[PDB]
Design an enzyme around this catalytic site. Structure first.
Site, mmCIF file in Angstrom:
data_model
loop_
_atom_site.group_PDB
_atom_site.id
_atom_site.type_symbol
_atom_site.label_atom_id
_atom_site.label_comp_id
_atom_site.label_asym_id
_atom_site.label_seq_id
_atom_site.Cartn_x
_atom_site.Cartn_y
_atom_site.Cartn_z
ATOM 1 N N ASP A 121 0.858 -1.182 0.000
ATOM 2 C CA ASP A 121 0.000 0.000 0.000
ATOM 3 C C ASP A 121 0.894 1.231 0.000
ATOM 4 O O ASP A 121 1.748 1.381 0.880
ATOM 5 C CB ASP A 121 -0.931 0.008 1.215
ATOM 6 C CG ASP A 121 -1.645 1.335 1.395
ATOM 7 O OD1 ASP A 121 -2.328 1.779 0.450
ATOM 8 O OD2 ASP A 121 -1.528 1.930 2.487
ATOM 9 N N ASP A 179 1.230 5.159 0.381
ATOM 10 C CA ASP A 179 0.530 6.307 0.940
ATOM 11 C C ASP A 179 1.293 7.601 0.681
ATOM 12 O O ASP A 179 1.626 8.336 1.617
ATOM 13 C CB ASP A 179 0.290 6.103 2.437
ATOM 14 C CG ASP A 179 -0.687 4.975 2.716
ATOM 15 O OD1 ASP A 179 -1.071 4.272 1.757
ATOM 16 O OD2 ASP A 179 -1.075 4.793 3.889
ATOM 17 N N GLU A 214 1.560 11.185 0.153
ATOM 18 C CA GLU A 214 0.668 12.261 0.584
ATOM 19 C C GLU A 214 1.380 13.603 0.446
ATOM 20 O O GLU A 214 2.122 14.007 1.346
ATOM 21 C CB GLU A 214 0.206 12.044 2.022
ATOM 22 C CG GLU A 214 -0.745 10.880 2.212
ATOM 23 C CD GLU A 214 -1.039 10.612 3.674
ATOM 24 O OE1 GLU A 214 -1.631 11.492 4.336
ATOM 25 O OE2 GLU A 214 -0.675 9.522 4.164
ATOM 26 N N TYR A 273 -11.690 11.722 4.924
ATOM 27 C CA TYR A 273 -11.635 12.325 6.248
ATOM 28 C C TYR A 273 -10.588 13.431 6.218
ATOM 29 O O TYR A 273 -9.978 13.705 5.181
ATOM 30 C CB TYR A 273 -11.340 11.282 7.335
ATOM 31 C CG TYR A 273 -10.275 10.270 6.973
ATOM 32 C CD1 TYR A 273 -8.937 10.635 6.896
ATOM 33 C CD2 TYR A 273 -10.608 8.946 6.719
ATOM 34 C CE1 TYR A 273 -7.961 9.712 6.569
ATOM 35 C CE2 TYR A 273 -9.638 8.015 6.392
ATOM 36 C CZ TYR A 273 -8.317 8.404 6.318
ATOM 37 O OH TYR A 273 -7.349 7.482 5.993
HETATM 38 C C1 LIG Z 1 -1.827 20.478 8.934
HETATM 39 C C2 LIG Z 1 -2.829 19.890 7.940
HETATM 40 C C3 LIG Z 1 -3.488 20.728 7.036
HETATM 41 C C4 LIG Z 1 -4.396 20.127 6.149
HETATM 42 C C5 LIG Z 1 -4.603 18.751 6.198
HETATM 43 N N1 LIG Z 1 -3.932 17.976 7.102
HETATM 44 C C6 LIG Z 1 -4.189 16.621 7.091
HETATM 45 O O1 LIG Z 1 -5.106 16.081 6.179
HETATM 46 C C7 LIG Z 1 -3.504 15.772 8.025
HETATM 47 C C8 LIG Z 1 -3.721 14.362 8.070
HETATM 48 C C9 LIG Z 1 -3.003 13.619 9.015
HETATM 49 C C10 LIG Z 1 -3.191 12.104 9.126
HETATM 50 O O2 LIG Z 1 -2.290 11.425 9.481
HETATM 51 N N2 LIG Z 1 -4.474 11.496 8.800
HETATM 52 C C11 LIG Z 1 -4.677 10.058 8.922
HETATM 53 C C12 LIG Z 1 -4.112 9.221 7.772
HETATM 54 C C13 LIG Z 1 -4.621 7.951 7.536
HETATM 55 C C14 LIG Z 1 -4.103 7.190 6.498
HETATM 56 C C15 LIG Z 1 -3.081 7.718 5.726
HETATM 57 N N3 LIG Z 1 -2.617 8.928 5.977
HETATM 58 C C16 LIG Z 1 -3.087 9.677 6.957
HETATM 59 C C17 LIG Z 1 -2.108 14.261 9.886
HETATM 60 N N4 LIG Z 1 -1.379 13.466 10.856
HETATM 61 N N5 LIG Z 1 -1.941 15.580 9.814
HETATM 62 C C18 LIG Z 1 -1.006 16.265 10.702
HETATM 63 C C19 LIG Z 1 -1.359 16.143 12.157
HETATM 64 C C20 LIG Z 1 -0.839 17.490 12.972
HETATM 65 C C21 LIG Z 1 -1.688 17.734 13.907
HETATM 66 C C22 LIG Z 1 -2.843 16.680 13.749
HETATM 67 O O3 LIG Z 1 -2.642 16.081 12.335
HETATM 68 C C23 LIG Z 1 -2.612 16.337 8.903
HETATM 69 N N6 LIG Z 1 -2.421 17.696 8.840
HETATM 70 C C24 LIG Z 1 -3.084 18.484 7.944
#
Ligand SMILES: Cc1cccn2c(=O)c3cc(C(=O)NCc4cccnc4)c(N)[n+](C[C@H]4CCCO4)c3nc12
Ligand SMILES: *[C@@H]1O[C@H](CO)[C@@H](O)[C@H](O)[C@H]1NC(C)=O
Ligand SMILES: *[C@@H]1O[C@H](CO)[C@@H](O)[C@H](O)[C@H]1NC(C)=O
Length: 536
Positions: free
Chosen positions: A287, A289, A291, A366
């Protein structure tokens, strides 16, 4: 008058096709993949007629033959792991005699030497059967075995078709993985994991949690595989058709993907993945990811419109790699990817070109909104747009339609469910008793992090009257609000999760997947199974 019954000599009874140094910190010092184990046995004769033939049989099948009929030994290769009854047989012209059987353990990373996983059906999870033919996936986080205390044996495994392991890191120092530096200890821990490892090779972020930490059934200090990986092997023994996929990347590990303009580094990554799956045979594919292609991920300094072309090149070569991996092992491997649900990220990639190599697309419906903004409040994972902002473009339905417009087959799309809440505090200045119309003073107090709450905590506090619950019927999204303090959290609950299941069935989509499995009390994964048509 056959030879005298031999007696086996005391010696090592556990052998590893894939060796694991239980005290290493660098990945190349941690594991050594071999094509077979070297099993040795000795025996003692008492009648002393140098018999013409000796043999070593494992479960009555021959693995070695030699003429050691005067207290000898034998070494031989065993290429398939498992538990073997070992017997030494001696023969003359009159007949044969066989030693008593002793058991040997030939360990391999497919779990063939381990019993099935002794999983717990805890909390509010209730068992389902995977009858719908829909994808039911969930993420298991590597770091979940620490204060979360969610080992693999807590995963309700009959309620899933896919388990995604987050995350598998790509290795590199300053400039390659700087997104890790915004988490204390992580960047340095990756450097330790890859001391002496080529950059842009795959690795294991936490070798302790992955392979060395004692877990249920894997505590004996000569257990070759412990931690998450060992439990995942026992998971494979429990449900052999549950797909276990490694998730390369994530939010803070996606930076090395952007350097794949250089094909030299792409071949090295793709080749390291092949060696990774041969080393860890319990994984059923890969998979990816990334991003995200084009940027707008964690690191604001990488991204390019060219990333869409290379994202397709990566999927093509990974698929060719998996196809020649299939030619060696005869197994069927799966190629998936977690992609953004925002249209501005989808258009960066022509997914109709990449989809021919991919089995599933994990549509991350999400994180549409979050505490990264004090002003832009909204639903983090709703199905449609709310009435107070009908033109909202960051919704599940808008993203699915945008992706379908590219020509993506509906069956490949798997809709994302949030087992967590993103929230704010001090929400003020709102009208119409709609807290989303206001602004926030900061993130809400979270379970393990500012602004992120486990659904398990959301549900518990709701039962204790600590929240004022609402459901956006138009957008199909729940949210809790505390008026006296401005606390507002958006998340997915059983009602919205069921509505996502209806949506997947009404549009012939692939199914549902959720992040993260340790943040659920059972209600969400229950609603994922019921919403997709599985039998209870
Ligand atoms: C700053 C920010 C701005 C806009 C979007 N953002 C995210 O869409 C995001 C996603 C994630 C994430 O992991 N989603 C679950 C996941 C599941 C499966 C695969 N990939 C990811 C993430 N950790 N942060 C940063 C941390 C910092 C504080 C809390 O979120 C993210 N920040 C941002
Ligand atoms: C939110 O507001 C607080 C206080 O007003 C401020 O310190 C913080 O930096 C803001 N955060 C964002 C992401 O705007
Ligand atoms: C929220 O902040 C934005 C940024 O200037 C402002 O335009 C808006 O009026 C604010 N809303 C409230 C309710 O104060």
């Amino acid at each position: 008058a056959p030879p005298g019954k031999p007696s086996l000599g005391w010696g090592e009874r556990t052998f590893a096709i894939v060796e694991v140094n239980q005290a290493a910190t660098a990945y190349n010092q941690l594991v050594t993949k071999r094509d077979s184990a070297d099993v040795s046995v000795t025996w003692n004769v008492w009648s002393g007629d140098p018999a013409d033939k000796a043999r070593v049989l494992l479960n009555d099948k021959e693995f070695w033959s030699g003429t050691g009929g005067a207290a000898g030994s034998a070494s031989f290769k065993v290429k398939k792991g498992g538990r073997y009854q070992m017997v030494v047989e001696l023969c003359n012209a009159d007949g044969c005699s066989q030693s008593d059987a002793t058991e040997i353990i030939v360990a391999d990373t497919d779990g063939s030497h381990l019993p099935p996983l002794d999983y717990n059906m805890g909390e509010k999870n209730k068992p389902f059967k995977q009858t719908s033919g829909k994808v039911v996936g969930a993420y298991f986080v590597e770091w979940g075995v620490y204060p979360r205390k969610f080992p693999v044996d807590r995963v309700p495994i009959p309620n899933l078709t896919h388990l995604l392991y987050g995350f598998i890191p790509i290795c590199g120092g300053d400039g390659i993985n700087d997104s890790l530096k915004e988490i204390e200890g992580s960047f340095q821990a990756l450097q330790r994991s890859c001391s002496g490892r080529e950059d842009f090779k795959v690795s294991i972020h936490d070798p302790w949690a992955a392979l060395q930490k004692p877990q249920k059934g894997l505590s004996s200090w000569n257990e070759p595989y412990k931690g998450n990986f060992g439990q995942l092997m026992m998971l494979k023994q429990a449900k052999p058709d549950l797909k276990i996929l490694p998730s390369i990347g994530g939010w803070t590990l996606a930076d090395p993907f952007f350097f794949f303009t250089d094909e030299t580094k792409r071949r090295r990554f793709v080749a390291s993945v092949k060696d990774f799956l041969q080393t860890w045979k319990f994984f059923d594919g890969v998979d990816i990811d990334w991003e995200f292609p084009g940027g707008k991920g964690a690191n604001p300094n990488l991204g390019s419109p060219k990333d869409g072309e290379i994202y397709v090149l990566l999927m093509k070569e990974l698929r060719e790699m998996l196809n020649e991996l299939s030619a060696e092992t005869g197994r069927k491997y799966e190629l998936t990817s977690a992609i953004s649900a925002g249209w501005d990220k989808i258009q960066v990639v022509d997914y109709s070109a990449a989809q021919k190599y991919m089995d599933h697309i994990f549509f991350m419906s999400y994180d549409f909104k979050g505490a990264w903004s004090n002003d832009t409040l909204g639903h983090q994972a709703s199905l449609y747009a709310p009435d107070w902002n009908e033109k909202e473009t960051y919704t599940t339905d808008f993203g699915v339609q945008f992706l379908l417009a590219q020509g993506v087959s509906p069956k490949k799309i798997v809709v994302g469910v949030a087992m967590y809440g993103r929230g704010w505090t001090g929400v003020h200045g709102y009208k119409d008793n709609n807290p989303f119309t206001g602004n926030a003073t900061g993130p809400v107090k979270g379970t393990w992090q500012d602004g992120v709450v486990d659904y398990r905590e959301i549900a518990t506090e709701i039962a204790q009257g600590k929240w004022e619950y609402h459901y956006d019927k138009v957008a199909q999204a729940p949210y809790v609000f505390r008026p006296a303090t401005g606390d507002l959290i958006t998340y997915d609950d059983a009602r919205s999760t069921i509505e996502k299941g209806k949506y997947v069935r009404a549009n012939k989509l692939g199914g549902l997947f959720a992040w993260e499995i340790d943040a659920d009390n059972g209600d969400i994964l229950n609603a994922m199974n019921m919403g997709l048509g599985n039998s209870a």
